[PDB]
Write a protein that binds this ligand. Sequence first.
Ligand SMILES: O=c1[nH]c2sccc2c2ccccc12
Ligand SMILES: [Zn+2]
Length: 208
Amino acid sequence: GTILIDLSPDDKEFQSVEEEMQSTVREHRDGGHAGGIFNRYNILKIQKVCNKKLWERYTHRRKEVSEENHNHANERMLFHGSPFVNAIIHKGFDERHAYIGGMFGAGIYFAENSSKSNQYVYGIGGGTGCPVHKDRSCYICHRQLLFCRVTLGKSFLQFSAMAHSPPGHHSVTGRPSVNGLALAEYVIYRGEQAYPEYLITYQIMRPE
Ligand SMILES: O=c1[nH]c2sccc2c2ccccc12
Ligand SMILES: [Zn+2]
């Protein structure tokens, strides 16, 4: 039921999605090990993901969270990188996209920093890098990230350096407490609390 609509680079929606992608790049404490060395991306394509059933699944759950949290969905747009982005756009998020070894438990992880999600495109810790060259820092191969609408609801705040949400909460917020430049990361425990709105195809760019 999924169709992908290609956005024109002249569309304001293309532009605002690209800007969120580029502006949320940061340096990482692994010196680029997982995700490569780059300060910015070459955005190749931005597609709107359209699936009525997956959307209504999202909005149904959003209303439930909202009504449990004084009419506040606490909805964000967050990045998600994963080897399984193609399963995700067709079938939605579910238990199989949970990070079992994650620091906030076995849920589905999202990032404010596009560059954080980039580290997961080829697997946990970047896996063995790109299929074709085995290069975690490949500048040639095309990568994809999802920019997702996520319902956080009442989020459990965890300061720091499929399971269930903490009792009385709808998500976990991993608040960075050491690296002053890191943005927040988030975990939901229900696949229906995220909708993969944009598929972004890109390459990381070698600095000069
Ligand atoms: O964007 C992310 N994708 C994936 S896939 C398995 C774990 C994660 C992950 C963890 C922390 C922050 C972002 C992400
Ligand atoms: Zn490659």
